[PDB]
UniProtKB/Swiss-Prot annotation, chain A:
Domain of life: Eukaryota
Molecular-function GO terms, alphabetical: NADH dehydrogenase (ubiquinone) activity
GO (cellular component) term, any one: mitochondrion
GO aspect biological process, one term: mitochondrial electron transport, NADH to ubiquinone
Species of provenance: Sus scrofa
The entry's keywords: Electron transport, Membrane, Mitochondrion, Mitochondrion inner membrane, NAD, Respiratory chain, Translocase, Transmembrane, Transmembrane helix, Transport, Ubiquinone
Subunit-level organization: Core subunit of respiratory chain NADH dehydrogenase (Complex I) which is composed of 45 different subunits.
Protein family membership: Belongs to the complex I subunit 6 family.
Top-level taxonomy: Eukaryota, Metazoa, Chordata, Craniata, Vertebrata
Catalysed reactions listed for this entry: a ubiquinone + NADH + 5 H(+)(in) = a ubiquinol + NAD(+) + 4 H(+)(out)
Record-given protein name: NADH-ubiquinone oxidoreductase chain 6
InterPro entries per the UniProt record, alphabetical: ComplexI_Subunit6, NADH_UbQ/plastoQ_OxRdtase_su6, Nuo/plastoQ_OxRdtase_6_NuoJ
Purpose: Core subunit of the mitochondrial membrane respiratory chain NADH dehydrogenase (Complex I) which catalyzes electron transfer from NADH through the respiratory chain, using ubiquinone as an electron acceptor. Essential for the catalytic activity and assembly of complex I.
Top-level EC class: translocase
The gene coding this protein: MT-ND6
Entry annotated with the keyword Transmembrane: yes
Swiss-Prot record, chain E:
Shown segment, full-protein numbering: 547 to 603 of 606
Subcellular location: Mitochondrion inner membrane
Chain's role: Core subunit of the mitochondrial membrane respiratory chain NADH dehydrogenase (Complex I) which catalyzes electron transfer from NADH through the respiratory chain, using ubiquinone as an electron acceptor. Essential for the catalytic activity and assembly of complex I.
Protein name listed in UniProt: NADH-ubiquinone oxidoreductase chain 5
UniProt record similarity statement: Belongs to the complex I subunit 5 family.
Membrane-spanning intervals of the chain: 36-56
Subunit structure: Core subunit of respiratory chain NADH dehydrogenase (Complex I) which is composed of 45 different subunits.
UniProtKB/Swiss-Prot annotation, chain F:
Annotated EC: 7.1.1.2
Protein's name in the database: NADH-ubiquinone oxidoreductase chain 3
Keywords: Electron transport, Membrane, Mitochondrion, Mitochondrion inner membrane, NAD, Respiratory chain, Translocase, Transmembrane, Transmembrane helix, Transport, Ubiquinone
Stated family: Belongs to the complex I subunit 3 family.
Superkingdom as given in the UniProt entry: Eukaryota
Record keyword Transferase present: no
Gene behind this protein: MT-ND3
Swiss-Prot record, chain J:
Primary residence: mitochondrion
Gene Ontology MF terms in the entry: NADH dehydrogenase (ubiquinone) activity
Gene3D superfamilies according to UniProt: 1.10.287.3510
Keyword rRNA-binding: no
Record lineage: Eukaryota, Metazoa, Chordata, Craniata, Vertebrata
Catalytic activity: a ubiquinone + NADH + 5 H(+)(in) = a ubiquinol + NAD(+) + 4 H(+)(out)
Quaternary context: Core subunit of respiratory chain NADH dehydrogenase (Complex I) which is composed of 45 different subunits.
Chain segments annotated as transmembrane: 1-21, 29-49, 61-81
UniProt function note: Core subunit of the mitochondrial membrane respiratory chain NADH dehydrogenase (Complex I) which catalyzes electron transfer from NADH through the respiratory chain, using ubiquinone as an electron acceptor. Part of the enzyme membrane arm which is embedded in the lipid bilayer and involved in proton translocation.
Gene: MT-ND4L
GO biological process: ATP synthesis coupled electron transport
Entry GO terms, CC: mitochondrial inner membrane; respiratory chain complex I
Pfam families, A to Z: Oxidored_q2
UniProt-recorded name of the protein: NADH-ubiquinone oxidoreductase chain 4L
Length: 175, 347, 52, 139, 57, 100, 318, 121, 46, 98
């Protein structure tokens, strides 16, 4: 079973996406997003991306959606909408799981599934490379090259964040 | 909004478009689009109204979806080619997704529904920026990826945009909505020639930009957002409404006005590629645009609508602010037809 | 001068957009939360019902 | 595009049942698309109302396609001229008449007959002469 | 009765000018639905995306 | 598998305690006991987000110190930090840091 | 002034001092408000704007001399006094023109206050003009639709400007006001009915005074008390209206206001709202004739400084 | 598209050094005169908008308009001629380099050719 | 005549000078460029 | 393409569909926006790690930098909408038509 941990995680990722995509109250949506973020971190870690996946755990889960939650709390709704609360939400939730199951089964049964692209049912372990990175974390060096090579990216991103602060101030002015 | 902050936001919008038109790496092009959106949103809400907030929200949602689809297309092209360079796109599905995203950014139908609403919500100056400057970046991106573009999808979007722009304008008595529908139709005209010859798209974009700049500056000078408020202008500033009539006739494409040359050259290039039915339908469908232009002209200048007694007060005063480029924009929008062969410069 | 040309029956009832801004609704965004500070409160000395 | 290929592969003026079936399918697809767009832009009050609207539009379009193909192929057989655009014109006017009948209006029927028949004859002429509605960039 | 009225002022006008004007008016009413609900036309975006993926590969 | 084991064990232990604390003591026999303002100061939360972004951008610095172009690296790192300080100063001076 | 000036560091707040204080002296007809307003302006060193009339704009534009009624105003207060219920619609034309004149005066007043920092004493204002309209509507002089149009214009325009800090109401009883009108001897003024004056007072006290008291403090004085101008000046100097808009306003709002008031056309933009009331709608032929006549006026053909007729020179290089 | 990818094209260069081989646009070119006319019209429209005397006021401003329009139009015409000359040069070079794609055709006199007559009866 | 001084009033001799100077420089530069271009064309094309 | 790519592309498609089909709340749609961004991050990270594109391992980070900028903009708009209408409901964004 440990042979397809990545696939199990990807299925959980899709399930969380169906959860927050069916639009329950933003509380449960936040829960689905949090679960999906953790699971994406798991997949990234499995592929060797410890730092990148951990970034989602902190700057995405404990970041963008940590305020998403703080926001919903300020705009409190009368009732916590759940999947079963609206027949459509529950129906779409079930259909989404069913859709995943259909493609999953087809991919496994039909060695080569083709929804919009062509996918092979072989385990993800196949695609991995047999090279050695030596005394290095390739992800770490690539990310740290943002200061040595990606100076232009640094400039543009910093300017965007400053203008984002100014923009948020201006939008929340309200005159 | 503090004027220094306003200048910084406008420069950020222009810098985003410059990054879009300057970068050879897809990630940076998407970054430029993100900067354009981030800087644009507060600019749309310079004057705080519930309508301004609603327009900003609609525009943000639409542009955010477009950017997300664009980034997915970039990621797919990376997956199948491993190339970040803006060049031929090596996956047809990525090409279709990118085309939909860029069309949504341009307001091409059937992604047009947000253009009239956003234009009506925002002020005339924000509308000018939205309908002139914002079009530059997606059109640049499409021109760079023109070869990969599937001609059928682009042509269908262009024809639908022309049809819908012509249809919507007939029903509108709000000047901003009329301008938005005209913008939709002209965007369809520009994107029609994109698969065939990009220089024609650039020429049409320049002519359209001059005409819309002139029209919006005339509206700002007349401070009219409705047909009747513009009708009142003949009593105050008859020259303004006369020049508005001339610019409207140009926008309709009537010869010998400058508005004729983009349509003429587009028809030429399409015919050279054996496209005969499509140019014919586009030219005929432009008559709806021409019709509501003519109705606006009847309301404004050709016919004298009733004024109000309080206008005698405005007679004594004069316009304080002068828009320097308005006369040259009018001249270019109306009398540049004898100078088409200079269309080899942008070439 | 209508809100929209060729107005349908439903659209005919609809008024033209306002000249400058939309009229804001009556509040419905925020108010003053009313709290019984005491009397059981530790800081209320036990017998103070401070309605704030 | 498979439906269009099915309609094209059947030789003109032959196998009238199959041609009518393919035209019926094309009409059904177009009616479903129009129904989806109408449901989206103009919301139906109830799910049953949405189903009724979808069925109405799809049946109208399928009837139009079926009559067009049926009449056109029958006319091609009887006249024994397969390539004449007049067969397509007759089919188009018949489809327009069916549109009028479904709309229960004479003026709609006459206008639809005229315009749709002219468009159908134009489509046949384009097939014959190699007209390209969408031309590959050759410049 | 025929030339001045039934043809010139009625039927030729009904055929070319008036019917086309009426059709354009009806289409203008359809397009300018004057509803403007984000929920409504965003669904159309989904339908358009699906249809484009199907038709244009 | 070690990290997965640790996560599983901790979660199961905590949930087991929650069970023995929500249901096990709930058995004990008893009787019947009967039984927001729009925060505009949420701007602080939003500013945290844009500052957390710079936080993320700054994390690679320990490995960034290992490059050979230490001049460029230092210039860009101080550039980002000075831009963050400028953002803080702007929000401070424009009374945007109106906490509570 | 311009965005450039604000960037150059021009700040209205710094210029504004205690002297800055928009004082409106309001009252019924012939209440003596002008005397008290003039005295307050003299004693407190504040600019005194006489009450806006039909040709207020004519005074602020061109030569300054009043223009012909057809060219400016197209309304007569004497006509209103003699024929309040005329089918010409002169009543509502007069009221709307007066409201526009008071809007221009308030803009000019605010511009003076922001540009110099000197307070302004106004005799009535846009916030008090509704009293006459209400009186006319109660007496039946104007229709309901005229009132609705006036309300639309006021709602669109007055919101932009900041209300006065100090409201001074001189109260004189209606019968004594009738006695004063008789003593003054103006033949048209004598025709004013008692009910019209009473409705003016009712509108004032019932609506304008409470509504102003909500924003800031209102100094209400009787005729004898209003005569002691120095006491009124002292009371104003010892007012402390911490509540109100002016303390809330900062440099940004002042810049926006400074820009608005500088553009007089922008100030009067919505006074010409396209509502086709019979009273205020001018036909195309008459409008064209009157505009031509205004254009033929000396010094009005071209923008100020370019009219050669009134002695402008160096136009070719100006 | 088309000339954008020509080899040797320096990006963001208005007039390449090769263009100097071409004749300069004559200062009496009708196109340059039309550009000056456009500038003069712009001056007139500016005067009309600002409610100045249309044909007499701001002679310096009208002069600046005409000078700017002519100055920009000169370089505009020079670049236009350069681009058209480049097109012609590339076309002729390609025709020479691909003789088979552009074969010389046998010329015949009308007596040799047969063109059917359609009588107008 | 006007109560308030005309905004432009006396001619802006600074502005007039700047405009005339810019126009003259434009014309002179154009003439020199034209001469140079004529010389270069004759030189490069014999 | 391995099945993980299929799953993540499916997640993006699902999130896109959810965004394009609003129900009442704007926050749910903004949740779908953030979710789509997560899908894109995971897809980009997997591609870059598998291909050993060392110099592109920062692209996922910049994507998230701008993802949070977009989220912040969305919330900054949502608060204003709520203030003007009392709810985040989409049906209140109805003043602008056509």
């Amino acid at each position: 079973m440990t042979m397809y941990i990545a696939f199990i995680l990807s299925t959980i990722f899709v399930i969380g996406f169906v959860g927050f995509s069916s639009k329950p109250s933003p509380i449960y949506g936040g829960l689905g997003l949090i679960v999906s973020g953790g699971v994406g971190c798991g997949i990234v870690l499995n592929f060797g991306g410890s730092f990148l996946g951990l970034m989602v755990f902190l700057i995405y889960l404990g970041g963008m959606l940590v305020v998403f939650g703080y926001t919903t709390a300020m705009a409190t709704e009368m009732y916590p909408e759940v999947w079963v609360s609206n027949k459509t939400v529950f129906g779409a939730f079930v259909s989404g799981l069913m859709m995943e199951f259909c493609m999953v089964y087809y991919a496994l049964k039909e060695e080569e599934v083709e929804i919009i692209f062509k996918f092979n049912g072989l385990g993800d372990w196949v695609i991995y490379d047999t090279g050695d990175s030596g005394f290095f974390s390739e992800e770490a060096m690539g990310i740290a090259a943002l200061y040595s090579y990606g100076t232009w990216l640094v400039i543009v991103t910093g300017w965007s964040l400053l203008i984002g602060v100014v923009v948020i101030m201006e939008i929340t002015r309200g005159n | 909004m503090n004027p220094i902050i306003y200048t910084t936001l406008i420069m950020t919008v222009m810098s985003g478009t410059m990054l879009v038109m300057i970068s050879s790496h897809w990630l940076l092009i998407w970054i430029g689009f993100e900067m354009n959106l981030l800087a644009m949103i507060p600019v749309l809400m310079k004057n705080f109204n519930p309508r301004a907030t609603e327009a900003a929200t609609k525009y943000f949602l639409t542009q955010a979806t477009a950017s997300m689809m664009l980034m997915m297309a970039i990621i797919i092209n990376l997956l199948y080619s491993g190339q970040w360079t803006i060049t031929k796109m090596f996956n047809p599905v990525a090409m279709t997704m990118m085309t939909m995203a860029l069309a949504m950014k341009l307001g091409l139908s059937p992604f047009h529904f947000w253009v009239p609403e956003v234009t009506q919500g925002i002020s005339l100056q924000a509308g000018l920026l939205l309908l002139t400057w914002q079009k530059l970046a997606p059109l640049s991106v499409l021109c760079q990826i023109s070869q990969s573009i599937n001609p059928n999808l682009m042509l269908t979007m262009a024809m639908l945009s022309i049809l819908i722009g012509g249809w919507g304008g007939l029903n509108q008595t709000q000047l901003r909505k009329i301008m938005a529908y005209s913008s939709i139709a002209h965007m369809g005209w520009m994107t029609a020639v994109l698969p065939y010859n990009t220089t024609m798209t650039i020429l049409n974009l320049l002519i359209y930009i001059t005409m819309t700049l002139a029209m919006f500056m005339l509206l700002i000078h007349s401070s009219a957002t409705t047909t009747l408020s513009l009708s009142h202008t003949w009593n105050k500033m008859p020259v303004i409404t006369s020049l508005m009539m001339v610019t409207l006739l140009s926008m309709g494409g009537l010869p010998p006005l400058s508005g004729f040359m983009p349509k003429w050259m587009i028809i030429q290039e399409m015919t050279k590629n054996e496209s005969i039915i499509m140019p014919t339908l586009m030219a005929m469908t432009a008559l709806l645009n021409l019709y509501f232009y003519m109705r606006l002209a009847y309301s404004s200048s050709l016919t004298m609508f009733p004024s109000t007694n309080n206008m005698k007060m405005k007679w004594q005063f004069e316009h304080t602010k002068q828009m320097k480029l308005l006369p040259t924009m009018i001249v270019l929008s109306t009398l540049v037809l004898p100078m088409t062969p200079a269309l080899s410069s942008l070439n | 001068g209508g809100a929209v040309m060729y107005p349908t029956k439903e659209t005919a009832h609809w008024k033209p957009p306002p000249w400058n801004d939309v009229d804001p609704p009556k509040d419905t965004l925020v108010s003053n939360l009313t709290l019984n500070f005491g009397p059981q409160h530790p800081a209320a000395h036990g017998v103070l019902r401070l309605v704030m | 595009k498979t439906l269009l290929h099915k309609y094209s592969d059947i030789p003109e003026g032959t196998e009238c049942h199959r041609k009518a079936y393919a035209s019926t399918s094309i009409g059904g697809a177009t009616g479903l698309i129009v129904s989806a767009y109408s449901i989206a832009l103009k919301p139906p009050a109830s799910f049953l109302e949405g189903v009724a609207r979808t069925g109405r539009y799809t049946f109208t379009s399928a009837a139009i396609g079926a009559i067009f193909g049926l009449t056109s192929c029958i006319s091609a057989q009887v006249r024994e001229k397969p390539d004449d655009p007049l067969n397509y014109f007759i089919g188009g006017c018949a489809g327009g008449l069916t549109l009028g009948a479904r709309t229960r209006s004479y003026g709609i029927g006459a206008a639809a007959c005229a315009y749709m028949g002219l468009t159908a004859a134009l489509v046949k002429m384009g097939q014959l002469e190699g007209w390209q509605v969408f031309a590959e960039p050759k410049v | 009765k025929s030339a001045s009225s039934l043809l010139d002022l009625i039927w030729l006008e009904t055929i070319l000018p008036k019917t086309t004007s009426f059709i354009q008016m009806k289409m203008s009413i359809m397009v300018s639905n004057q509803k403007g609900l984000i929920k409504l036309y965003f669904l159309s975006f989904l339908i358009t995306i699906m249809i484009s993926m199907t038709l244009f590969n | 598998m070690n990290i997965m084991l640790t996560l599983l064990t901790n979660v199961t232990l905590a949930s087991l305690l929650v069970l023995i604390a929500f249901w096990l003591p709930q058995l004990n026999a008893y009787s019947e006991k009967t039984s927001p303002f729009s925060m505009k100061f949420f701007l602080v939360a939003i500013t945290f987000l844009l500052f957390d972004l710079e936080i993320a951008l700054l994390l690679p610095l320990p490995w960034a110190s290992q490059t050979n172009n230490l001049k460029t690296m230092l210039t860009m790192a101080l550039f980002l930090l000075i831009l963050l300080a400028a953002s803080l100063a702007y929000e401070w001076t424009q009374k945007g840091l109106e906490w509570a | 002034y311009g965005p450039l000036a604000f960037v150059l560091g021009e700040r209205t707040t710094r210029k504004l001092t205690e002297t800055s204080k928009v004082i409106t002296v309001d009252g019924n007809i012939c209440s003596g408000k002008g005397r008290l307003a003039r005295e307050i302006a003299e004693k407190l060193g504040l600019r005194h704007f006489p009450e806006a009339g039909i040709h207020y704009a004519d005074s602020t534009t061109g030569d300054g001399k009043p223009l012909d009624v057809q060219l400016s105003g197209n309304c007569s207060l004497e006509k209103f006094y003699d024929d309040p219920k005329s089918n010409d619609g002169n009543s509502y034309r007069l009221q709307s023109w007066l409201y526009a004149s008071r809007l221009l005066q308030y803009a000019d007043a605010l511009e003076h206050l922001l540009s110099t920092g000197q307070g302004v004493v106004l005799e009535r204002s846009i916030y008090s003009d509704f009293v006459f309209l209400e009186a006319m509507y109660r007496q039946g002089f104007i229709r309901k639709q005229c009132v609705e149009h006036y309300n639309e214009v006021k709602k669109v325009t007055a919101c932009e400007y900041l209300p006065p800090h100090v409201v001074v109401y001189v109260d004189v009883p209606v019968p004594e006001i009738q006695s004063r009108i008789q003593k003054k001897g103006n033949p048209h003024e004598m025709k004013i009915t008692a009910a019209y004056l009473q409705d003016i007072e009712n509108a004032y006290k019932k609506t304008f005074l409470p509504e102003m008291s909500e924003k800031c403090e209102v100094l209400q004085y009787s005729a004898r008390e209003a005569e002691d101008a120095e006491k009124v000046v002292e009371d104003i100097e010892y007012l402390k209206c911490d509540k109100g808009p002016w303390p809330d306003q900062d440099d940004r709002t002042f810049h926006r206001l400074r820009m608005l008031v500088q553009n007089k056309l922008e100030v009067l933009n919505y006074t010409t709202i396209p509502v086709y009331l019979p009273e205020i709608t001018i036909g195309a032929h008459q409008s064209d004739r009157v505009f031509q006549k205004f254009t033929e006026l000396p010094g009005r053909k071209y923008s100020p400084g370019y009219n050669e007729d009134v002695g402008d020179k160096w136009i070719w290089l100006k | 598209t088309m000339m954008s990818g020509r080899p040797g094209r320096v990006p963001l260069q208005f007039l390449p050094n090769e263009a100097r081989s071409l004749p300069p646009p004559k200062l009496t070119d009708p196109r340059l005169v039309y550009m000056g006319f456009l500038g003069y019209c712009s001056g007139l429209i500016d005067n009309a908008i600002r409610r100045r005397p249309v044909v007499s006021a701001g002679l310096h401003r009208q002069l600046l308009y005409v000078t700017s329009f002519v100055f920009f139009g000169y370089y505009l015409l020079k670049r236009q001629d350069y681009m058209y000359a480049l097109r012609d040069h590339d076309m002729f070079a390609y025709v020479k380099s691909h003789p088979e794609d552009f074969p010389e055709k046998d010329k015949k006199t009308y007596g040799e050719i047969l063109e059917e007559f359609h009588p107008v009866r | 005549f006007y109560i308030r001084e005309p905004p432009h009033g006396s001619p802006d001799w600074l502005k007039v000078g700047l405009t005339l100077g810019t126009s003259v420089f434009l014309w002179i530069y154009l003439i020199k460029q034209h001469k140079e271009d004529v010389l270069e064309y004759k030189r490069r094309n014999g | 393409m391995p099945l993980v790519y299929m799953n993540i592309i499916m997640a993006f498609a699902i999130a896109l569909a959810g965004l394009l089909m609003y129900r009442s709340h704007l926050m749910s749609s903004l949740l779908c926006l953030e979710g789509m961004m997560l899908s894109l991050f995971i897809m980009s990270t997997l591609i870059i790690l598998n291909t050993h594109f060392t110099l592109a391992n920062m692209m996922p980070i910049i994507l998230l930098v701008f993802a949070a900028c977009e989220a912040a903009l969305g919330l900054s708009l949502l608060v204003m909408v709520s203030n003007t209408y009392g709810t985040d409901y989409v049906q209140n964004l109805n003043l602008l038509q056509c």
